[PDB]
């Protein structure tokens, strides 16, 4: 995350971190707790991994130093990708992992509720992005969960920026005009979360952009409501 | 104008240590990264890692991880690339380079280390 | 490593890939022998200061592709991709345009 700050303890209860254990166990993504079996994060995460063998999922982690030989993880039991996503596209950026156990419910540690099917993201003005990504574009996955506040940008607003890019109705863009505040690498797959009505809700995962936080380049995140029907099939 | 001036040739024989460095001046040293790359004779670029001359982090590839330490001292803009127990593999034309994107890149001129008995 | 014949003129199109968490952070590199390697391309697309136009670049997902629209004489080298991802950076494998001649 650029420009971000830390998070504290039990802040984002829905943040996890997915590592790989090969050849070295170590972050890969973010993810989202939304049932007690199931993580939403981005489908290209998983470019050179396809054994759901060798994930580990932590979640209630806000330092990746907290993580130790014998700290509880959970397993994989099944990476389900969107089918329409391709690995010579960036678009159905989503994917679910099923938990081989179950989460338990704590302060520090629960799903986060998805928008409702029909919602409209103009309605938010306060939404944050997390994760343990880089502060710029070269740099170093960060010890401490980060945060930061970004604006939603219009679809057609985000189009005039990727003139070369296809920005559908299934991603959303967020970044200030000037930059300064955006995920960047090792954020993929963390959340978008906005604060209204005093609920959180998962509107984004974080998928591509142009850099890190550059002036007129949003970043583009998976639009989560445009995917309600695909995620309650593939849960039940 | 940006210059990047590496040392001179080196030979060492295999299990030694050889320690290049890289001279920067034109811009500001701690302002960007300098990475290190080598290409062994008719063969591609292979990138070694990267130091941070601001706060002195470093990265390197998996391959050179625990044989190779980047340094810098700057207020000589000079990153040295040290790398230990040499192999007859490791004979190449060593680079050192300013790579940051949204500039121009600059390289060093290289360094031949040959590593042989 | 590969190599490429082309003619004068010709429009050559190299494909590099690289994870899309790389967020763009690709460039495309030239090598001339007994040179260092010189950047045309930075951030998958964008050219840099001093390359002439005919060089473009392009990244979609995992695929990032180099043009050059119609070689010149001065084109033919060696061109590598740089990728940049979240715990180290690669260079591709080479690919030499050699003159067909």
């Known amino acids: 995350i650029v420009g971000g700050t830390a998070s504290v303890r039990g802040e984002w209860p829905w943040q996890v971190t997915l590592h790989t254990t090969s050849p070295t166990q170590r972050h890969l993504c973010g993810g989202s707790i939304i049932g007690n079996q199931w993580i939403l994060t981005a489908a290209h995460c998983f470019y050179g991994v396809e054994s759901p063998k060798i994930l580990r999922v932590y979640s209630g982690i806000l330092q990746q130093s907290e993580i130790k030989e014998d700290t509880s993880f959970f397993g994989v039991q099944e990476i389900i990708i969107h089918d329409q996503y391709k690995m010579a596209e960036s678009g159905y950026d989503i994917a679910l992992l099923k938990l081989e156990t179950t989460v338990q419910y704590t302060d520090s540690q629960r799903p986060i509720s998805l928008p409702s099917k029909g919602d409209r993201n103009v309605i938010y003005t306060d939404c944050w992005v997390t994760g343990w990504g880089y502060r710029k574009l070269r740099d170093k996955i960060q010890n401490t969960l980060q945060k930061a506040k970004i604006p939603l940008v219009t679809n057609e607003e985000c189009q005039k920026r990727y003139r070369g890019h296809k920005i559908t109705h299934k991603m959303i863009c967020a970044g200030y005009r000037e930059g300064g505040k955006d995920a960047c690498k090792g954020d993929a797959g963390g959340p978008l979360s906005c604060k209204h009505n005093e609920v959180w809700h998962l509107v984004g995962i974080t998928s591509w952009g142009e850099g890190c936080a550059q002036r007129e380049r949003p970043g583009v995140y998976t639009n989560v409501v445009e995917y309600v029907d695909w995620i309650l099939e593939k849960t039940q | 104008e940006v210059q990047l001036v590496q040392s001179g040739a080196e030979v060492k024989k295999p299990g030694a240590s050889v320690k290049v460095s890289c001279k920067a001046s034109?811009?500001?040293?701690?302002?960007?990264?300098m990475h290190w790359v080598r290409q062994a004779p008719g063969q591609g670029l292979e990138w070694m890692g990267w130091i941070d001359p601001d706060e002195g982090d470093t990265n390197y590839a998996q391959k050179f991880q625990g044989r190779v330490t980047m340094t810098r001292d700057t207020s000589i803009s000079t990153a040295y690339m040290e790398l230990s127990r040499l192999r007859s593999d490791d004979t190449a034309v060593y680079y050192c380079?300013?790579?940051?994107?949204?500039?121009?890149?600059?390289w060093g001129q290289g360094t031949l280390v040959t590593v042989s008995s | 490593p590969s190599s490429l014949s082309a003619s004068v003129g010709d429009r050559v199109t190299i494909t590099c890939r690289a994870s899309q968490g790389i967020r763009n952070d690709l460039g495309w590199y030239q090598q001339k022998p007994g040179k260092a390697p010189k950047r045309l391309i930075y951030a998958a697309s964008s050219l840099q200061s001093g390359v002439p136009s005919r060089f473009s670049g392009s990244g979609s997902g995992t695929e990032f592709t180099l043009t050059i629209s119609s070689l010149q004489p001065e084109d033919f080298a060696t061109y590598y991709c740089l990728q940049h991802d979240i715990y180290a950076s690669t260079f591709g494998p080479g690919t030499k345009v050699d003159i067909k001649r």
């Open positions: 034109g811009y500001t040293f701690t302002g960007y990264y």
């Open positions: 380079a300013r790579l940051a994107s949204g500039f121009r890149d600059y």
